[PDB]
Amino acid sequence: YSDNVIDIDLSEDSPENYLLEHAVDGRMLFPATGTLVLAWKTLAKLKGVEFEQLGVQMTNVQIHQALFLNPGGKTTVSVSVMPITGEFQVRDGESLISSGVITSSEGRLLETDQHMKKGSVLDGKPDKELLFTKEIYREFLLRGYEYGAAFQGIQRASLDATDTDIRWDGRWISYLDTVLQMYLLSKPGTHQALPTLLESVTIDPRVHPAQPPEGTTEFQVLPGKWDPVLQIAAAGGVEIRSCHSIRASRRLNHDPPILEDFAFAPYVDPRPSDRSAAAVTPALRDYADACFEFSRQGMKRWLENDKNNVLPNKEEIKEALAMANKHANFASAKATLEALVNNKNGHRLPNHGLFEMLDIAFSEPLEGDYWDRLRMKLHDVRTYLWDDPIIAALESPDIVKLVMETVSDNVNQQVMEILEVGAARGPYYRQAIPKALEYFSIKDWQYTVADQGFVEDAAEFPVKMMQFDPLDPANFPAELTESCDLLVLKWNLQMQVDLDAAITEFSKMIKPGGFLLVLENGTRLSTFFPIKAIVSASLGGKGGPEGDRAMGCFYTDAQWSALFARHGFEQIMHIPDGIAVSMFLLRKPFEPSVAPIIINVDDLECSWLEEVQARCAELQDSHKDSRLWLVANTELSGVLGFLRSLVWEFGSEKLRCIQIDDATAGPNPPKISADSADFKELVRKDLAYNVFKNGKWGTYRGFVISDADRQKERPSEYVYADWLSAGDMSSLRWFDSPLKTGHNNGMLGSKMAHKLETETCSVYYAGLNLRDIILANGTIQRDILPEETFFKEGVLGVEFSGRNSSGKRVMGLCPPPALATTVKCPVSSLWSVPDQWTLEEAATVPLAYATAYYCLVSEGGVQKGATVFIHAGASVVGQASIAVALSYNCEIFTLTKNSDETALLKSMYPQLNDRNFCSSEDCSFEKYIRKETKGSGVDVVINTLRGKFLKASRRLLSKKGKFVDIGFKVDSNTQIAYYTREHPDLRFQLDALLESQGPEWTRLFDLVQAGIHSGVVKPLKRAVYSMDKIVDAFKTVEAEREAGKIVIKIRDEERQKVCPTPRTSFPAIHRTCFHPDKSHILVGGMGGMGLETAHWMVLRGAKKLILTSRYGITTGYQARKIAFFKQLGVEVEVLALSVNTRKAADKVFEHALKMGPVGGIFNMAMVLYNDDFLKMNREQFLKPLESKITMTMLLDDKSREKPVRDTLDHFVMFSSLIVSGGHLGQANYAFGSTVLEKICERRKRDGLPVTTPQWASIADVGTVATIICRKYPQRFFNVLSVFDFMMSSDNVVTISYVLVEKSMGVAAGEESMVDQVLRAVGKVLGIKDVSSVDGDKEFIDMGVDSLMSVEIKQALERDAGLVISTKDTQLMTFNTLRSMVKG
Ligand SMILES: NC(=O)C1=CN([C@@H]2O[C@H](COP(=O)(O)OP(=O)(O)OC[C@H]3O[C@@H](n4cnc5c(N)ncnc54)[C@H](OP(=O)(O)O)[C@@H]3O)[C@@H](O)[C@H]2O)C=CC1
Ligand SMILES: *P(=O)(O)OCC(C)(C)[C@@H](O)C(=O)NCCC(=O)NCCSC(C)=O
């Protein structure tokens, strides 16, 4: 000698550790079939039998939450099976994780006879007609389902996935999941579907084979079958009937990718159009002038009002006015600058810092204790100068990265040593680290700050503090000699009395081949002086041959150059920010002792491989002064990426580059040839990469693209409303609409059967219904809508009012998205606006009355004089129902929230009296309605309320009475009724009718048309919201705080009645779309990236694909996907040829033009031979070069002639990060990739479309099928998210790579529970740094969805003792979050 507390041991060697091998987007969930084996093992205990000798049949199994497993942890769950009836729970405390009805039995329970099949039907088939375990679980991985070797049961399957071979290893949770995978494998797609309701599961172990013999290694495989007629996935002694799932937002396993623009930047004196030029916008120029005037007059007032003579450096102050007037009221100065500050015209500098401290240094009363007193006030607002547009113009992320990386390319060590002497006055770590150094992956860095004392602001940075006087040479610690590769001198070499002595000592600290970074004032030297004399104590700087220091510290920019040049310093970069400070990157000259060796690389046929190979072999045998110079005087040449890869195996101490771009070379092309003039200048600087482009020497650098630029809005003619993140109403934006191509996305599958006639109408007003709010806020997934909308771009908006193609005014309902600026409305759904309604009023009529007629006349069959009960009389559907019922001469009973709604309805309908209204707050209407109707009941009920109001409404139904239920938020039991066909689902019927537009719709169309003519259909009261307030409008609909219709105003109605709509553009976010009438060539599109991106193009509009591969279809994965595209309605064609000759190119474009005009050319072909450079012969060096040189050039040629030039829209050439960072062994691949990018850059020069993605590592599909160069591989769904941005952008080459960290690895100190949960809860929301976000912003404002709310609530229980409700996690901030744990 409740009913079962079951514990799952997730330990190192526990038998249930395999449950960790079942994840979904990194998170580890408890399988949906684990609640069946838990109820089946609890009924067996209840019946006193072994669980493997009991035959059960679970029905209507539901899953309400998801247990979140955890490595090395114990999770408990309580099952409870009701003895007689058979109702079971899997409760996990007070929260339900699953439910259903388990009912054991003895007779036969299995419906399908698969339990008798013995052998496998997938025998003797070719390998191209079969899917193996590698290919089956590549498809699941793409959708987020990550299964380990334990859950990888399906060992083989057919192309249609009907027949499979399932491994039987004796683990039932694993086995059942491998049978549920059959249902998953039968619904190809790209979204992540989470099972929620298994209608009928039948497990019969009596017919199942026995447990495998102990120690077995060759587990037997049972045949499996999928039955689409009945939706039964049967295998062995298991049968899972109809299952249902819900789309779930895919979560990013890693941190967001780092997008960059691989662009050329000049070294010295960049022009305003160059990327290394200081970002001095006209507004900043005005501020610089504005601050100059305020400083100057404040300088003069200082002189006059200093009657106490308590102003130090007064002689220096006087000199400032002398220079200020030479290089040229106080209240007006404040007025002008204050106007600049207080203005909010969009053109607004990030902050106005220099003025504020100048004001603080001028507004201070001139009394005793001035010098020391004011020193403290400004030292308190020192940050204002540091973060100030005027100063942060030579420290913009572009320039800082250029300095740090260009130094890194030339430093021939593994650790980059930096030294910022004088980090207390002018800090550079706060800019160098977050903007340039944190992105380093191939090279390590070691920052070291130094000043007189402790640098307080450097406490939080990964720098090393050092104590030594910076402004006193001859005492600099001798241990600093040859200690740094880079020496930063931000506002330091101006405060040393003898700068001639200053750098002489500094030049000894730099390593041989090191650099000096110098940032000093060089212009408008009277602007920053008011706040310099009063800080600096010994303002006694001595002059020199270059002149006399301005005031006593500064040297003019042209005189800084003279000093360094005189002392033997080569200017590497001299970016002369023209407003104030100027930059100087200097390196000591290199004097070679052996003649450098130049080798021409121009040839694209690699006729130079042998010469380069021999010299490269002689590198590590010569002087330290021997250098190999690979040169090239052509735009098309892969020297820049080729050298990067050679350095990865030979070191950067002997390899140099020179490339001259002929197209952009200036009037005087550099004549680099052995003993030349220009060449000798390069040898002295000794820069690893020298590129002559746009007329100046420079280098290629990856400039970061801010996260805000990915959502930058640009004008677009056709736009539509969608959500950036599902389930968020605050994420609604306007995207580019596919209607710019003429057609509408989603013409695949069912939508291809109904060939409706459509009219292209220009939307003027769009009405918002409660159907849109229910979809936007995540209350209902987009899968509940008719299946014709599955592939549509959006699902928001149905009704509208605008002008058809002829200029006539119209209104009507169309399949979504009608919340756009152009719609293709079927001609059978278009009414005409009578010439008395404004288009604003017509936007309120169509759906409200179409639903009202459907409910009353079409579904309830209302008759004259019948009684009707309408819920929510104040709603737009409710107001329409009252109007229609009144026209039918009925007795109306309505529910109103408050008295204001009653007042509105009585005024709107004078017929209604107070007797016809009730209260929606409590269920007292049932008594009143039954009494007032004398017990006969109501003939029709239009029901929207739920719970006890729904039951009460049904009980008022007459003997014939009809119940029309149009509520959206149905209960789980009600939803199962819809699935079971027990009840009809009428809440998405207007949507269903509009897709078909059959006899049932035409009845409503005629009804509403007659209603308009007879005066019953009248416009409703409305509130108009501008397009940009779309988010605000949606919230107002959801709140239901006031009665009325909400219509978004797209355009302005013209005074005429038949007039063309003017062409105008709307701000919108990018959304790439492909013309369905054009043919897209995907060269090498049968690979891993090509097949999964071709799917992406199909969803976005493409319907004519030509996939070319060297061999054609050769595997079961390729044959299955091609079959999927063709079934959808795509006109695919696989060509088994290689485009390496003109004839092959002609063939490809003969087939392409046969399908239709060419509208896209992609090249994802790749053959890679990895080996050591010195062990490559020519035949092996040009292996990758065929697909990346011999292919792109031929494709480029055909994309320049007619008719391809005019019709072509996209020209994508996939590249690799090897061109930007280099890699070991793939020297040939680097040469091929670099030439490919130089071809793409040429196209951009001629104005042709071009896009060159540069990926680092792609996870789900590709050659990876983990951490390379400290770079994580991207999930493919994220690749296509940034790929979309790449196409809709102006740059040519974009770099996308995911960084493991910026040092997190081996770095942490969390301890208190009050912080342990924060990182967990912060991680759940996808916030890498919890403290970064606001401590008062509600979680729903961040976009807290469900599953993400479930995890937070479950995480609190698992991590602490808190038990909260999901209703609070969406209104429960970070500050209140931290309070609960402590309590
Ligand atoms: N880790 C990654 O996945 C990365 C990918 N990239 C780029 O992505 C692109 C594709 O990646 P992936 O798809 O994984 O490469 P795969 O090797 O996965 O597939 C490459 C495809 O190229 C096709 N191909 C090769 N040569 C030719 C040719 N001469 N004519 C026609 N087709 C050809 C092959 O078809 P067959 O097999 O029939 O010859 C093969 O299916 C490549 O260009 C690569 O540079 C960039 C960075 C990293
Ligand atoms: P919101 O949309 O309210 O979230 C509802 C959720 C939590 C998703 C719930 O309805 C649900 O279905 N939870 C997940 C069920 C589950 O256990 N799935 C995992 C096993 S199946 C597998 C392939 O993931």
| 3-class DSSP assignment, residue 1083 | strand
Kindly tell me the burial class for residue 743, based on how many C-beta atoms sit within 10 Å of its own C-beta (0-12, 13-18, 19 or more): middle
Angle between helices 1313-1324 and 1374-1382 (to 10 degrees): 140
Handedness of CA 327, 333, 339, 341 (dihedral sign): positive
Distances, alpha carbon 1326 to alpha carbons 254, 1259, 1330, 1346, 1352, in Å: 9, 20, 9, 14, 12
The β-bridge relationship of strands 581-587 and 1293-1299 is unpaired
Ligand number nearest CA of 31 is: 2
* 176 Cβ below 6 A of ligand 2: no
From residue 760, alpha-carbon distances to 738, 767, 955, 1062, 1268 in Å are: 13, 18, 47, 15, 51
The Cα 573–Cα 275 span in angstroms is 13
* Spacing, Cα 1054 to ligand 1 middle (Å): 55
Which structure tokens are listed for 601? 């690389």
Helix, strand, coil shares, percent, the chain, to 5: 35, 20, 45
d(CA 801, CA 763): 6
User: Which of 460, 567, 565, 592 lies closest to 508, judged by CA?
Assistant: 567
Q: Is the CB of 1255 under 6 A from ligand 1?
A: yes
Q: Is the peptide bond before 817 cis (omega within 30 degrees of 0)?
A: yes
CA of 248 to the centre of ligand 2 (A): 8
From the CA of 1189, the nearest ligand is 1
Ligand 2 centre to CA of 250 (Å) is 13
β-strand partners of 510: 484
Distance 1085 CA to ligand 1 centre (A): 8
* Calpha distance 125→946 (Å, rounded): 55
Give burial (CB, 10 Å; 0-12/13-18/19+) of 1011: buried
Ligand 2 atom nearest residue 145's Cα: 23
Ligand number nearest CA of 1111 is 1
For ligand 2, atom 3, the nearest C-alpha belongs to: 1346
Pocket flag, ligand 1, residue 1343 (CB < 6 Å) = no
Q: Is there an atom of ligand 1 within 6 Å of 1090 CB?
A: yes
Out of 1110, 1135, 1231, give the residue to mutate to test ligand 1, the one with the largest number of ligand atoms within 8 Å of its CB.
Answer: 1110
Task: Give CA–CA dist 404/419, Å, rounded.
Answer: 13
Give the side-chain half-sphere CA count within 13 A for 138: 22
1039: nearest Cα among 907, 897, 922, 899: 897
- What spacing in Å lies between the alpha carbon of 1127 and ligand 1's midpoint? 25
d(CA 1319, CA 1359): 11
Nearest ligand by distance to the CA of 1091? 1
Task: Name the nearest CA neighbour of 392 among 530, 572, 523, 519.
Answer: 519
Distance CA 454, CA 607 (A): 59
* Location of structure tokens 């930007």: 1220
Q: H or E segment at 1005?
A: helix 999-1014
Asked if residues 612 and 655 have their Cβ atoms less than 8 Å apart, the reply is no
Q: How far is the CA of 918 from the centre of ligand 2 (A)?
A: 40
User: Please, which residues have CB within 8 angstroms of residue 172's CB and are 6 or more apart in sequence?
Assistant: 37
Q: By alpha-carbon position, which residue is closest to atom 22 of ligand 2?
A: 194
Helix (H) or strand (E) holding 542: none
Can you spell out the DSSP letters for 1205-1226? HHH--EEEE-EETHHHH--SS-
Give residue 693 CA to ligand 2 midpoint distance, Å: 56
- Please tell me if the CB atom of residue 1088 comes closer than 6 angstroms to any atom of ligand 1: yes
Which residues, other chains included, contact 484 with Cβ-Cβ below 8 Å and sequence gap of 6+?
417, 418, 419, 448, 509, 510, 511, 514
**What residues contact residue 1080 under an 8 Å CB cut-off, 6+ apart?**
1074, 1097, 1102, 1104, 1105, 1106, 1158, 1159, 1160, 1161, 1162, 1210
Q: Which atom of ligand 2 is nearest to the CA of 66?
A: 17
Is residue 124 packed enough to be buried (19+ CB in 10 Å), middle (13-18) or exposed (0-12)? exposed
The residue whose CA is least distant from atom 14 of ligand 1 is 1262
Distance CA 884, CA 729 (A): 33
Please give the single-letter amino acid code of residue 834. P
Shortest CA distance to 891 belongs to which of 866, 861, 910? 866
Closest CA to 939 of 987, 1014, 888: 888
Single-letter amino acid, residue 176? L
Helices (H), 909-987: 925-932, 948-955, 972-980
Cα(1038)–Cα(1139) distance, integer angstroms: 57
What does the block give as tokens for 1026? 């501008």
> What ligand 1 atom has the least distance to the C-alpha of 1138?
30
Question: CA–CA separation, 98 vs 30, rounded Å?
Answer: 11
Q: Say yes or no: CB of residue 194 within 6 Å of ligand 2.
A: yes
Nearest Cα to Cα of residue 1297 among 1274, 1314, 1331: 1274
Please give the C-alpha separations between residue 795 and each of 750, 772, 780, 788, 1296, in angstroms, as whole numbers.
16, 8, 12, 11, 31
C-alpha to C-alpha distance for 844 and 1100, rounded to whole angstroms = 32
User: Is 763 in contact with 1050 (CB distance < 8 Å)?
Assistant: yes
Report residue 1271: phi and psi, to 5°. Answer: -110, 120
Burial 321-355 (b: 16+ CB within 10 A, else e): bebbeeeeeeeebbeebeebbeeeeeeebeebbbb
Resolution of the coordinates in A?
Answer: 3.1
Ligand 2 binding pocket mutation candidate from 194, 246, 1366 (most atoms within 8 A of CB): 194
Note if the bond before 834 is cis, omega within 30 degrees: no
Which residue's CA is the closest to the ligand 1 atom numbered 3? 1262
Nearest alpha carbon to residue 704 among 282, 383, 1048, 256? 256
Instruction: Say if ligand 1 is within 6 A of residue 1087 CB.
Output: yes
Say how many Å lie between the CA of residue 1086 and the centre of ligand 1.
8
Is the minimum distance from the CB of 1187 to ligand 1 under 6 angstroms?
Answer: yes
Please tell me if the CB atom of residue 1350 comes closer than 6 angstroms to any atom of ligand 2: yes
Which is the closest atom of ligand 1 to the Cα of 1139?
30
Choosing from 1081, 1166, 1297 the residue with most ligand 1 atoms within 8 A of its CB, the one to mutate for a pocket test is 1166
> CB of 1336 within 8 A of CB of 1301?
no
* Contact of 626 with 655, CB cutoff 8 Å: no
The verdict on the CB of residue 32 being under 6 Å from ligand 2 is yes
Please check whether residue 428 is in contact with residue 542, taking contact to mean a CB–CB distance below 8 angstroms. Answer: no
C-beta of 1216 in contact with ligand 1 (< 6 A): yes
Backbone angles phi, psi at 1132, to 5 degrees: -85, 155
Ligand 2 centre and the CA of 1350: distance in Å? 10
Report H helices in 15-161: 34-46, 133-142
Q: What residues are paired with 132 via a beta bridge? A: 156
Q: Name the residue type at position 123.
A: D
Atom 46 (ligand 1): residue with closest C-alpha? 1216
Q: Which one of the ligands is nearest to 69 CA?
A: 2
Check pocket membership of 24 for ligand 2, CB cut-off 6 A.
yes
Strand-by-strand arrangement of the 1079-1083 sheet: 1131-1136, 1104-1109, 1079-1083, 1158-1163, 1210-1213
CA distance 808 to 802: 8
Which ligand does the CA of 34 lie closest to?
2
**Is beta strand 891-896 parallel, antiparallel or unpaired with respect to 867-870?**
parallel
Q: Rounded to an integer, what distance in angstroms lies between the CA atom of residue 1217 and that of residue 1233?
A: 9
- Give nearest CA residue, ligand 2 atom 23: 194
Question: Does residue 861 come out as left (phi exceeding 0), alpha (psi in the -120 to 50 range) or beta?
Answer: left
What phi and psi, each to the nearest 5 degrees, are found at residue 362? Answer: -120, -30
Is the CB–ligand 2 distance for residue 63 below 6 Å?
yes
* DSSP β-bridge partners for residue 1132: 1105
Q: Which atom of ligand 2 is nearest to the CA of 34?
A: 20
Buried b (16+ CB within 10 A) or exposed e, 191-223: bbbbbbbbbbbbbbbebbeeeeeeeeeeeebbb
Q: Backbone phi, then psi, for 367, in 5-degree steps?
A: -135, -170
Pick from 322, 337, 297: nearest CA to 305: 297
Q: Coil, strand or helix: which one is 475? A: coil
Note the ligand closest to the C-alpha atom of 143. 2
Among the residues of 517-591, which ranges form H helices? 557-566
Confirm or reject: Cβ of 66 under 6 Å from ligand 2.
yes
State how far the Cα of 491 lies from the Cα of 659, in Å rounded to an integer. Answer: 35
Q: Which of 498, 493, 448, 455 is nearest to 474 (CA)?
A: 498
Containing H/E element for 330?
Answer: helix 330-342
Residue nearest to atom 24 of ligand 2 (CA): 194
- Residue bearing the CA closest to ligand 2, atom 2: 1346
Q: How far away, in angstroms, is 1339 Cα from ligand 2 center? A: 20
Spatial distance between the Cα atoms of 97 and 94, rounded to a whole number of angstroms: 10
